[PDB]
Design an enzyme around this catalytic site. Structure first.
Site, short mmCIF file in Angstrom:
data_model
loop_
_atom_site.label_atom_id
_atom_site.label_comp_id
_atom_site.label_asym_id
_atom_site.label_seq_id
_atom_site.Cartn_x
_atom_site.Cartn_y
_atom_site.Cartn_z
N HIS A 90 22.45 67.18 -16.33
CA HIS A 90 20.86 67.51 -17.02
C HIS A 90 21.14 66.96 -18.40
CE1 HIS A 90 16.94 69.76 -18.10
NE2 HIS A 90 16.56 68.81 -16.88
N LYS A 102 9.01 76.26 -10.58
CA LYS A 102 8.64 76.37 -11.37
C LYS A 102 8.17 78.21 -11.72
CE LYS A 102 9.18 73.92 -14.05
NZ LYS A 102 10.49 74.00 -14.63
N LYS A 128 16.30 72.03 -7.25
CA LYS A 128 16.94 72.11 -8.11
C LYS A 128 16.38 73.51 -9.23
CE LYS A 128 17.01 70.50 -12.85
NZ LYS A 128 15.89 71.12 -13.20
N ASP A 177 16.77 75.58 -12.04
CA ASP A 177 16.32 75.63 -13.74
C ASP A 177 17.26 75.52 -14.97
OD1 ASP A 177 13.90 77.00 -16.07
OD2 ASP A 177 14.51 75.02 -15.75
N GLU A 178 17.02 74.78 -15.43
CA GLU A 178 17.64 74.27 -16.89
C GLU A 178 18.12 76.17 -17.74
OE1 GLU A 178 17.47 73.55 -20.33
OE2 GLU A 178 15.01 73.58 -20.11
N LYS A 187 4.86 53.75 -18.94
CA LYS A 187 4.94 52.96 -20.28
C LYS A 187 5.00 51.67 -20.18
CE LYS A 187 9.25 54.96 -19.56
NZ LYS A 187 8.68 55.90 -19.09
#
Lengths: 80, 456, 453, 79
Positions: free
Chosen positions: C278, C159, C185, C187-188, C318
């Protein structure tokens, strides 16, 4: 023509009114007969031969249900 | 953040000339204010925090930050607002549309505290416009290649036929092109399918083009569909189509993507063919007026990525609430400086830095009685596609082309003489359909419209 | 032949085994019936005519048109119906999913006599499943390549992403991977911005991977984002990442498209690289419950086109209804035969003909206290991505990695012995966080214990 | 400290456990910075730096992992 509405469906359904859902109407120059009945130009088409419009088939495409049977889609309306 | 104004909602901030502005229309959940929702939209499409505990190691902060600088309500609608926010220039790659999309609309549309979100417009700075290629050729170069001056161009898609052999396909193309049209379009569903593979189609279409162009005397074409499963298949189809000597090809930029469209546009620029873009699968994103991505944003992204023609939709049937917006985004892709005008949908002032324009294509169930209107609305820098208004003439394919050609020439020649085209449309068409049986039959098959009692 | 029959709504028609079925949920305008709207949806997404005056010039028709065969209504909702449609097999070409998309969801969504339209499911025949390549590797081959058996895999996202030099990026990756994680990972949003280009980031990430893997003994990895502006740049990045020796890359299949994703999948099969997909820019298509394209259709199209991992989002919070649906399509990504069960969203019976599976990925702000639930729901065939749950530990990055590793191993060992994880998950975490300081600090920082039913 | 939900502020989006600041005060040394008792094996003895915060006196918030607001993506996608 047969109907003077601009472009309209049946009261509820999507079926077109002018063509009754068939997509083809009867010629309006020869009334399904298939032969001229009056000179339509200077001298190009004389009465007593094949109808100048339908060329002797007695059936033409329909104007609003533009070949289709209903009043939506890429055939009978404008893309937004 | 606190009573302190969120560090993201800075209403006294004026944006630089090298900032990318964006205007969202949002509607929030019950019990949530508007200013906090604006600041949260600003923080979601950037560093996802309001505070400063993550993005502070030594100095880097507030530089890669999407300040929000304007929130207003929407007139008429209840519980619906406009949020103008502004991103820096260092967040975006140089020459990539994929990155701009993934950065703006990446994962903000899934924010939970927002009931609905739409992206209405966007403003690229000149510093970012000049790193993209743009359309391969444009308007003037494409008009000079084909040698068609004055009038708009005509075309006829062959839409309803399917399951035709390759030879009958070539034959219909020949009959249309010989009759007096300019272009002809493949159905967008047609690809290398078992009843009609692609190389046979290309061969016979090229033969028809050569015959009709040699025996007519002007330059004619046919949009060949080079949409493929892979980069390799696509480039292979395009190379073979260039070998045969074809002037123009086709592609669709929403099912194939933006990477493939950029690649194809660079190939077309290197090899000198024109590119026609077909907007398919677009109503999935921009039909509902409360969620999605309005289409003018995609028109701008296409003018950046590449493409010479673009389907824009007709306006003969829409009301002034939408005819205005469509005329707005048609000027957004032809001119070179667009002033902000909220009645026409344009939110920001956009300057295009002498980048060429694209060409709007008006299509879909139009016939001769519409020709006065179109020539008045779109002007003469456009293309007109006649799906059924050509192939359905009472006695053939070539007579229908001749009828449409005659009608267009009559309308243009009448406009040059000062005559009105909203009061005298029917008059022009009827007085022209007297020395030609084709136009008489065409006028007799379809029906007049009389737009609105004198005009519009 | 008249449209008193509609010629397209054949209710007694039984679909063949080589027909592509589609299920739309539509809501029509005020004044249009349901049967007409079903026939119009069948005609819009095919030859757009009800009549035969146009096509049937020479004795050929009826073999290139879809036909509605079931228009049941929706339970509960008012003025909403389901419509089932069957398309022949010779309308689509082989190996191309862009063709399937542009032939089904083409102009049908722009229909005027329809207030709203959504595409809920789709069924590919085996005849058509067998012409696509599928996932490059699958699940079995992937577990064998990475050599990790009997537990989920662990990953971490970074992040502090924006405005961080390439060398500090490499150092953070090294600290994380050395602690005990498996994947990191990228970042996108990070492709080639002027403050951090891609080549000098691939370099330092590869260096950190080599150090930490030669030091720990396991096999480490970092998803390297290869999304580029063109086909050529994308291939250039992928070739460089292979030359360095990287085992896995990343891509975005909704912004880059399906042509680029198929090209990359073929490359990855020929060159032995794994591919992680992604799902950015998806809520713009499939958030609203009344217009769009449900996500399970895109998951199916992905499993066909190519991909090894796929983001699917957590299911722990959920409540119900919209939870049992998610699990639904997880079964459409790992299994081989799925029977129809409308309670979980599956409309048709789908048989995949021994095509490999796809690995779900959970993410989105989960911490150690969620470890039991996840390990019980997704099973052991999944990856767990942690965001702040690893970089926020009071001690650093390696302690946070160690904490998550310990928690996962404890929960797995507890499930093996035959202990219920819904009831006494927190008890296991507390009994394990006694001989480890890192797990104790973690259990004390994320105060929310759980909802223990 | 331990409240039931993630706890947005009343009619707002701001986090409650931190009131928007993003960080909270350590609940082990009470902001003092020095241990109070023995904890594991007598290896964290009273008088030295706090075992949790290690002398920073502040730790990360829990419900809103530094985001400051709740509905975000590093604090919410556990639904």
């Amino acid at each position: 023509a047969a109907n003077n509405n601009p472009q309209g469906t049946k009261p509820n359904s999507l079926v077109c009114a002018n063509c009754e859902g068939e997509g083809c109407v009867a010629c309006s120059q020869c009334k399904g007969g298939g032969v001229n009945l009056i000179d339509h130009f200077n001298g190009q088409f004389k009465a007593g031969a094949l109808c100048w419009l339908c060329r002797g088939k007695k059936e033409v495409l329909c104007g609003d249900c533009n070949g289709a049977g209903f009043i939506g889609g890429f055939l009978s309306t404008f893309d937004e | 953040v606190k009573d302190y104004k969120l560090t993201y909602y800075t209403p006294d901030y004026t944006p630089k000339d090298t900032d990318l502005l964006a205007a969202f229309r949002f509607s929030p959940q019950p019990g949530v204010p508007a200013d906090e929702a604006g600041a949260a939209i600003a923080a979601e499409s950037s560093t996802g925090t309001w505070t400063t505990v993550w993005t502070d190691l030594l100095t880097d902060m507030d530089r890669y930050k999407g300040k929000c600088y304007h929130i207003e309500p929407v007139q008429g609608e209840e519980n619906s607002y406009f949020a103008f926010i502004a991103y820096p220039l260092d967040l975006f790659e140089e020459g990539s549309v994929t990155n701009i999309l993934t950065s703006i609309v990446g994962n903000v549309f899934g924010f939970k505290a927002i009931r609905s979100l739409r992206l209405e417009d966007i403003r690229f700075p000149v510093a970012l416009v000049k790193t993209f290629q743009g359309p391969p050729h444009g308007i003037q170069v494409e008009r000079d290649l084909l040698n068609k001056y004055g009038r708009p161009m005509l075309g006829c898609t062959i839409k309803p036929k399917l399951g035709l052999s390759a030879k009958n396909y070539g034959r219909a193309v020949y009959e249309c092109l010989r009759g007096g049209l300019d272009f002809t379009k493949d159905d967008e569903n047609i690809n290398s399918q078992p009843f009609q593979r692609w190389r046979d189609r290309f061969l016979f279409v090229a033969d028809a083009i050569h015959k009709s162009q040699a025996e007519t005397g002007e330059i004619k074409g046919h949009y060949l569909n080079v949409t493929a499963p892979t980069c390799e298949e696509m480039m292979k189809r395009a190379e073979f189509a260039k070998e045969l000597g074809m002037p123009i090809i086709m592609h669709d930029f929403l099912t194939a993507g933006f990477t493939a469209n950029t690649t194809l546009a660079k190939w077309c620029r290197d090899n000198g063919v024109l590119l026609h873009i077909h907007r398919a699968m677009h109503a999935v994103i921009d039909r509902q007026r409360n969620h999605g991505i309005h289409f003018r944003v995609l028109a701008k992204c296409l003018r950046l990525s590449g493409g010479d023609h673009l389907h824009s939709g007709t306006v003969v049937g829409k009301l002034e609430g939408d005819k205005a917006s469509t005329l707005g985004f048609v000027d957004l892709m032809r001119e070179d400086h667009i002033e902000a005008d909220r009645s026409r949908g344009v939110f920001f002032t956009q300057d295009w830095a002498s980048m060429p324009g694209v060409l709007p294509v008006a299509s879909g169930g139009i016939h001769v009685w519409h020709m006065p209107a179109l020539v008045e609305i779109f002007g003469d820098d456009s293309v007109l596609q006649f799906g059924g208004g050509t192939l359905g003439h009472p006695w053939g394919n070539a007579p229908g082309a001749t009828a449409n050609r005659v009608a267009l020439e009559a309308c243009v020649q009448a406009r040059n003489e000062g005559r009105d085209l909203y009061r005298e449309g029917g008059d022009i068409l009827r007085e022209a359909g007297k020395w030609s049986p084709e136009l008489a039959a065409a006028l007799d098959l379809w029906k007049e419209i009389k737009f609105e009692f004198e005009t519009m």
